[PDB]
Amino acid sequence: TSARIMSRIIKITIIVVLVLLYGEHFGMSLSGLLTFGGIGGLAVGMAGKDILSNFFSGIMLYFDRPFSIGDWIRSPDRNIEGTVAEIGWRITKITTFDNRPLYVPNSLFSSISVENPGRMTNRRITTTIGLRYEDAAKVGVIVEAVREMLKNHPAIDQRQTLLVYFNQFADSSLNIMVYCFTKTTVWAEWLAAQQDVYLKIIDIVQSHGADFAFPSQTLYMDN
Amino acid sequence: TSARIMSRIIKITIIVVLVLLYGEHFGMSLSGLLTFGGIGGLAVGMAGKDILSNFFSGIMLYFDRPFSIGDWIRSPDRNIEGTVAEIGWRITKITTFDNRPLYVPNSLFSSISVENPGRMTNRRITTTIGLRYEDAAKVGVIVEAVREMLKNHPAIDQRQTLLVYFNQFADSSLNIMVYCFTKTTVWAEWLAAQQDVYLKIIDIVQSHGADFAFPSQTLYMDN
Amino acid sequence: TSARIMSRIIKITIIVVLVLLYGEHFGMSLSGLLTFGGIGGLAVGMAGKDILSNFFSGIMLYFDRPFSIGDWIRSPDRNIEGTVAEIGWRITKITTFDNRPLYVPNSLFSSISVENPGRMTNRRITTTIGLRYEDAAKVGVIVEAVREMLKNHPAIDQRQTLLVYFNQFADSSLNIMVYCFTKTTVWAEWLAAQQDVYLKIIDIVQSHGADFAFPSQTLYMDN
Amino acid sequence: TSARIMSRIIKITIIVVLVLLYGEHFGMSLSGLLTFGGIGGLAVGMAGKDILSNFFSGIMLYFDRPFSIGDWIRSPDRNIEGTVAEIGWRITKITTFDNRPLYVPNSLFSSISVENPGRMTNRRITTTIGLRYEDAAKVGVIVEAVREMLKNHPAIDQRQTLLVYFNQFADSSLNIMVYCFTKTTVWAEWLAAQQDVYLKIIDIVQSHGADFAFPSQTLYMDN
Amino acid sequence: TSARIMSRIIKITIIVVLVLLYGEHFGMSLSGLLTFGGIGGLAVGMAGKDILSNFFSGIMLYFDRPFSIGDWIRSPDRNIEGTVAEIGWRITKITTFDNRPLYVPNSLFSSISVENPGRMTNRRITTTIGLRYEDAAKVGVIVEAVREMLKNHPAIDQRQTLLVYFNQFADSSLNIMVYCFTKTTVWAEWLAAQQDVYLKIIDIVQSHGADFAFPSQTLYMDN
Amino acid sequence: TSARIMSRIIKITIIVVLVLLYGEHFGMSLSGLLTFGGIGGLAVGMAGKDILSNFFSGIMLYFDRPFSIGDWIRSPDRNIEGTVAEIGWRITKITTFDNRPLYVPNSLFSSISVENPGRMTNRRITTTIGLRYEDAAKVGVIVEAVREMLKNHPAIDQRQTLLVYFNQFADSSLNIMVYCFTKTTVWAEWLAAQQDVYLKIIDIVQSHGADFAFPSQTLYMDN
Amino acid sequence: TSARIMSRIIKITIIVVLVLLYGEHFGMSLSGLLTFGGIGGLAVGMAGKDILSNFFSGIMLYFDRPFSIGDWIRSPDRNIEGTVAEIGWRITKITTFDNRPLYVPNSLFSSISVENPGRMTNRRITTTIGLRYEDAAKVGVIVEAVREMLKNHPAIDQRQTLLVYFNQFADSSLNIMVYCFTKTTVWAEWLAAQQDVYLKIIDIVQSHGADFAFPSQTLYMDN
């Protein structure tokens, strides 16, 4: 389709060949060549940017790929997520978890940090608890029961980092940092462990009479 | 219309021809040519930017189009949304859902991620529930009834990813992550499924006596 | 007025002519020409930017105008709004709705998305409702009465997109997405329809005993 | 004052003249000229920026001034406000409403939108009302009384845009958009009209028993 | 101290002289000169930036100083405040009100707006009042008593701008814009006037029974 | 695999060799060489940026490494954290605490501040207390008991900085700045000390009857 | 260690020497030299930036150091704080108050404001009080008692700036600006004075029956 389009590509090529042959035949004068000549390199230079660089930068990715099709590639910087679909020079298909294919320009991968959880070894499960000041005396023991359970639980990696401590003193709460790592990377398996853990842990704070806490205030009144 | 306008286009062309002929005839001296000559390439170089690059970058889009007229093209980066209308070198018409035609310069597509949900396979329906701590013991069973229903429902894709779990422990709530995918991409059909699902799910939490929850506080008072 | 001003314009012109004639007469030595010569093109190059580019970029706008005097031109990016007044190379007058004339430099139009609602086909009326959880069982029917009315109403375009659904589950509410399009673009006519619609709709939620909702909380107290 | 200062300006000038004369006399060799020569144009080129461009860009302002001494020049972009004081090439004095003279570099005017309300035709008076849901049935009539008054009032321009409508449905309120334009631009006159209008309008909502509204909540309690 | 340091400065100078003399003596071949030669100008060009520009830009400041030692120089843009201490080419000492000397690079003054309140003519005293809706009928008179007092007060400049009006309708309040200018620039004198004014004004709202207002709400409850 | 790929690398190399040999054989004319010639250096120049610079900048890191494999490298600027994994020219592997390997481009290390807590000497434990105004008279003594304990405690470094003071007056509280340093850098050991300290400190405020505080308000009511 | 590494540094040096000797021997043709030649200067030019500039900019710091080892150097701009450790060309060690050594690239010091409180003359102690509207009549006297004490106190510098005034009218409070300067810069001494001052001041507001204030509201209720 489209005459003018197909035409004008021949055109911007042919005249690079014409200037070349004209300064080799006549071009009297030689002087004006170099000059005209420079606007091509400079204008292509400031019209170039990413639109040209995508190909080099894509090739650099071709020498080695930090991400490899079968992985999802969160980036803290730019907002791109979900599994890497297919790799191409001008673009890079990438399915998101909403199954919409975002076409990422390749030059972006040149700059941003590009962690891929797809190559995970583990899933960190991080939580927080938070027990009323009323529960304050019993903090030492409740923490310990929770500390003990995680070791004995099958799902979590005992060898891996496993800290539970009074930690923060924050706000209206007494937040307690659960921090431990699950085995399986895979989504349903880890989530299921997490549910099992919160169900167990939730009971323990219930079990000793320490009560879970919500933001709370101190109203003052007149008579 | 307009003499000065029509005039001044002849002008910036004719003098490119005059410099060319002058350095071929006289121009004595040759030396001053190259020099004058360079301000053209440099000034066009720093007056060029996007205003020149739009055409190259549009052509690059002409070699392949990630978006293809019949689609809407959300971009997480820049704020442009709604169906792609017509494609042009200096611009790109694009109807928004408010039916206002935003004329996007083409150079922008060179940089930003440009997912198009128009080429969706599915609609993810993501929700959250959130049940009082009062409902805490019954969490395991309510979750399961909800877990069971989604599988049996006709609208959702059972084969596709389908997670429901206790997940977060957040705030004054016990948020539960519904996450499943509908069949039809199309707007009224999916929304109707969503309404059917929330109506069903809303009943289940009602049905077991677990109560939906709102932000809550702990007032303290004097006598 | 002003000698020094009028003087110094002659000056920065005349010496471009003097350098030209001096290197054609003497300038011995030729060597130092090219060199001096380059600081002009480079300094004009890095003192140029927008201050020079406004004219090219304005001309590009002269070849075709996405906005055409009789229209108002919101831009999601830069903060400029209101009807386009008059178009000029260094600037572009533009009345705002507060009737203050903002003089927009033309180079800006080169980059930002420039939707103009002035070329609207419709006005989307988007609302939200939000009914207490108390109203929860009756959600299916209230929605339907509202769904029915919009079709029958004369003001809205029935052919055009028209969705009403339970949609969100958010917060302390049960928000319901009204979404439909009015005929007339023009400001008083559409607003009047909107008032008629909200007055009608407001009654319906009132009519079935479902109550409109406001942020709500759950106070807890001591004895 | 200051020998070293006065000295070193002669110095960076004289040696531009020495290099010029040296390559015209000896400079054996010619080759090294051009080279040394280029660091001047390039270093002045990347040490130049705004510090050089202020003068060109100021001159461009001298060809035409969108702002003209007797006016105040808000800019949505950069934070500069208040009456324009005096215009100068390196700077531009500008009194602010706190009577502190901010010296704006001229290059800034090259980029930012520079509306000047000083050349206003009118003052838009925009308000909002907001009536309890309790007042909901009477909304149609209260609006009309308010609608009627503005037309009859002497201060507002009846010919000019004049919309009052139920508009928003927002939050805990029923906000009503007053929007009309005063005659006089000048500060005390318009403000006085505004006071007269709010005093009149405030009564009307009072007059029909509709009550003005404040953020409100729905406390829930135990026994 | 330090041989290697003192040594390596001689070094990067001497070899600029060696290349110059070598291409004037031998350098067979001339061709490679210009080339090597260019990396110096370009690398100094992209290693230059501010680190070189500070001196030019400082000199520009030396031709005229908008700020003059004995003044404090708030900038809306960059965060620098407090009295200007001493002026130097690479830097500019500047005491802050916390008496910590921040060394500002001079190039910054090239770009940012640099108002100096030190050259003030006045101090604007801006306040806000805000009277319960309960006080609403009496707004006209309370405002007037306040309006009258400011004129009669010795401290404020009566000739200078002096507006008091109902202004805003905002929130839970009825905010009233006091706006007037004090005589003395100097810190203790103006503050003392401000205290005298607020003490006087505070009484007037007290005096008519209008009550000052705080954010307020509308609790709703069950039985 | 892939013919076109393997092919096109030969191609962009071979023609650099062809242009070189062609201008050495024919190339008639010499003039057009330099010109064509420049577009290569300029286009590689504006397609280069980081994609080329990563290697130089990586080498600079190779001369000396502020971070050394066995350390974690928080950066206040860019969001990268966790232990440094392996170092490579195009990238730098880096495990995060979630065990996901983020591949950092090396050029980034050139700009951002890169503190590594891995080379810590200590752990600062910073807290805050905050005692009701009710506790106000006893502030001097409670502070002292807390001041005394930290000195006597084995875990904290007494020699190191150790301030405890009334400090802030903020909000509804009387915040007290605990600030002291633990011995062991290592994660479980320090956290355990922190738990021991907060448990001890929590008792002291309890012990004197001063009560810990939460945000509090002053309700006002009608009859 | 590492053959390939050690090898490839020889390599990128040796071929700069080979091109030089080749165009001096053959290089037939001379023409292609200059051209190839330029890609080196340009690519080093756009791969250079900070990675090259760190050394120049470090040297500039070597000519004079605004910060001098024994000082801590807060910067309002970039987030770097704490005592300056050691100074080096590629970097600058700097201990933070958490005793983690952040390695700052030197080029940063070229741009940002770099106040160093280490060279303080004083410590400003700034506070705020805030007394219920209930305390309003007594504001004049309480302020004066506080005004008097600071003069008589030994710790504060009476000669130095010393303002106390009703100042703000803000919010639910009547905030009073204490502002005075302590003698000793050093951390424990000044903090101790601050504690002594707040303890004294706290009593005075207590002493006259004015009560310290917290955010407060006005609940409204039904029957």
Numbering used by the authors:
A (entry chain G), B (entry chain F), C (entry chain E), D (entry chain D), E (entry chain C), F (entry chain A), ...: 113 to 335
Paper text:
Mechanosensitive channel of small conductance (MscS) has an indispensable role in the protection of bacterial cells when the cells experience a transfer from a high osmolarity medium to a low osmolarity environment. In the present study, we characterize a Na+/K+ cation-selective MS channel, YnaI, which exhibits small conductance among the family of MS channels in E. coli.
To understand the molecular mechanism of the Na+/K+-selective characterization of YnaI, we solved its structure at an overall resolution of 3.8 Å (3.6 Å at the cytoplasmic domain) by cryo-EM single-particle method. Similar to previously reported MscS structures, YnaI comprises seven YnaI promoters bearing the MscS channel fold and forming a homoheptamer. The heptamer extends ~117 Å parallel to the sevenfold axis, with ~87 Å in width in the perpendicular direction. Secondary structure analysis predicts that YnaI contains five TM helices, while we only identified two transmembrane helices (TMH4 and TMH5) in each YnaI protomer, which may be due to the flexibility of the other three TMHs. Consistent with other MscS channels, YnaI contains a large cytoplasmic domain and comprises the middle β-domain, α/β domain, and a C-terminal extension forming an interior chamber of about 30 Å in diameter. The isolated C-terminus of β10 in each monomer forms a seven-stranded parallel β-barrel (residues 327–343), leading to the formation of a potential channel pore (referred to as the β-barrel pore hereafter). The structure of YnaI closely resembles that of the closed conformation of TtMscS and EcMscS with root-mean-square deviations (rmsd) of 3.05 Å and 2.3 Å over 223 Cα atoms of the overall structures, respectively. These structural observations suggest that YnaI structure was resolved at a non-conducting state. Indeed, YnaIM158A in the TM region alters the mean reversal potential from −39.2 ± 0.5 mV to −20 ± 0.5 mV, corresponding to decreased cation-to-anion (PK:PCl) permeability ratio from 9:1 to 3:1. Further simulation and mutagenesis validation supported that seven methionine residues formed a circle and bound anions with different binding energy, leading to elegant modulation of further passing of cations.
